[PDB]
């Protein structure tokens, strides 16, 4: 009933696909090469997300056990613990952040079913991935843009799932850095440099921030409140941008690619009475994002965890 897991590869090879300084104009040939190079990793991310979604849907212990079996197998293989292979950028380092976010969120959703021996194989594997991801940010030259926030999500989730306070603190640090980047106009300077994809990259930066706030909520802490609800300024900047890109068009000088808001709207619409602001975006779901933890529609309604 539980299909055999695919083999875990120690190395990641991934390829950058922007042609311009502002990381906004895509080279189709490099994009497809990146897709083909990362297809095993994205298939595994999608599979553990879906199987962990099915556990939350009906409580089926088979779904949880299959998720834990796939996680255990990649742990045993030292998956993603080898070389981060560079072709034209650090796209491999980014894949290890996104993959940690998927696998650590999948593990958190099924953790309540995990026996002491599954915990002993999976916990140390997630913890080394988290430290590898933190170590990347030790170089002051790498600017702490949306990648930093996507990085914090996986480190925080590992922290929570494996009871590692050092990883929780480093996760919180990343959240707080992102909240403090939010300007009075609700913009993020490092995302404003991204041209026709500026609006896209505000949506992309907000998502891991929302999901770190949801993880805090599991421990009974309200991080939405930080800096008198500063996160609301970014949520407004994004949701109004999806309705009308004019403000972004004026501040970037580039015509924006039209944005449909990602599934952070599913959690956000429930944290305050929204007076209809997220009605249109909600109607575009359900939202499946393995790197945010899978079925955000399901998790916003029923909880990231069952207990």
Swiss-Prot record:
Gene Ontology cellular component annotations, sorted alphabetically: cell outer membrane; periplasmic space
Residues with lipid group (S-diacylglycerol cysteine): 2
Protein origin, superkingdom: Bacteria
Main location: membrane
Catalytic activity, EC: 4.2.2.-, 4.2.2.3, 4.2.2.1, 4.2.2.14
Key words, A-Z: Carbohydrate metabolism, Cell outer membrane, Lipoprotein, Lyase, Membrane, Palmitate, Polysaccharide degradation, Signal
Catalysed reactions, as listed in the record: Eliminative cleavage of alginate to give oligosaccharides with 4-deoxy-alpha-L-erythro-hex-4-enuronosyl groups at their non-reducing ends and beta-D-mannuronate at their reducing end; [hyaluronan](n) = n 3-(4-deoxy-beta-D-gluc-4-enuronosyl)-N-acetyl-D-glucosamine + H2O; Eliminative cleavage of (1->4)-beta-D-glucuronans to give oligosaccharides with 4-deoxy-beta-D-gluc-4-enuronosyl groups at their non-reducing ends. Complete degradation of glucuronans results in the formation of tetrasaccharides
pH dependence: Optimum pH for enzymatic activity is substrate-dependent, with optimal hyaluronate degradation at pH 5, poly-beta-D-glucuronate degradation at pH 7, and alginate degradation at pH 9.
InterPro entries with a match to the protein in the record: Alginate_lyase_dom, Chondroitin_lyas
Topology of the protein relative to the lipid bilayer: Lipid-anchor
A Pfam family matched in the record: Alginate_lyase
Residue intervals passing through the bilayer: none
Protein's cellular compartments: Cell outer membrane
Residues lipid-modified (N-palmitoyl cysteine): 2
Gene Ontology annotations of biological process type: polysaccharide catabolic process
Activity regulation remarks: Is inhibited by mono- and divalent cations as well as L-ascorbic acid 6-hexadecanoate.
Effect of residue 146 to L: Less than 0.5% of wild-type activity against all substrates
Single GO MF annotation: hyaluronate lyase activity
Protein family according to the UniProt entry: Belongs to the polysaccharide lyase 5 family.
Functional description taken from the UniProt entry: Polysaccharide lyase that catalyzes the depolymerization of several anionic polysaccharides via a beta-elimination mechanism. Exhibits broad substrate specificity, catalyzing the degradation of not only alginate and poly-beta-D-mannuronate (poly-ManA), but poly-beta-D-glucuronate (poly-GlcA or poly-GlcUA) and hyaluronate (HA) as well. The oligosaccharide products formed by enzymatic cleavage are comprised mainly of disaccharides, with a lower abundance of trimers and pentamers. Is not active on poly-D-galacturonate, heparin and heparin sulfate.
NCBIfam families, sorted: PRK00325.1-4
Protein name in the entry: Polysaccharide lyase
């Amino acid at each position: 009933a539980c299909p055999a897991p695919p083999p875990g590869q120690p190395d990641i090879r991934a390829i950058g696909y922007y042609t311009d300084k502002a990381g906004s104009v895509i080279d189709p040939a490099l994009q497809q090469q990146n897709k083909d190079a990362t297809a095993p990793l994205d298939r595994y991310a999608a599979d553990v997300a879906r199987m962990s979604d099915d556990y939350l849907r009906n409580g089926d212990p088979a779904a949880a056990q299959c998720t834990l079996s796939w996680l255990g197998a990649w742990a045993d293989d030292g998956a993603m613990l080898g070389q981060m292979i560079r072709v034209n950028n650090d796209q491999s380092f980014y894949m290890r952040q996104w993959m940690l976010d998927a696998v650590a969120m999948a593990y958190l959703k099924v953790h309540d079913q995990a026996n002491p021996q599954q915990r002993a194989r999976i916990d140390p594997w997630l913890q080394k991935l988290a430290r590898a991801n933190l170590a990347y940010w030790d170089n002051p030259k790498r600017r702490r843009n949306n990648h930093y926030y996507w990085g914090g999500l996986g480190v925080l989730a590992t922290g929570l799932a494996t009871d590692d306070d050092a990883l929780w603190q480093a996760g919180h640090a990343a959240f707080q850095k992102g909240i403090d980047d939010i300007q009075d106009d609700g913009s993020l300077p490092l995302e404003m440099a991204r041209g026709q994809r500026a609006l896209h990259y505000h949506d992309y930066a907000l998502a891991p921030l929302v999901m770190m706030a949801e993880l805090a909520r599991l421990r009974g802490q309200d991080w939405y409140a930080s800096r008198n609800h500063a996160i609301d300024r970014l949520a407004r900047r994004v949701i109004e941008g999806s309705r009308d890109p004019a403000w972004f068009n004026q501040h970037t000088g580039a015509a924006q690619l039209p944005l449909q808001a990602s599934g952070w709207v599913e959690f956000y619409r429930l944290r305050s009475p929204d007076g209809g602001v997220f009605d249109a975006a909600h109607a575009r779901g359900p939202f499946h994002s393995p790197r945010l933890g899978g079925d955000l529609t399901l998790m916003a309604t029923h909880g990231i965890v069952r207990t």
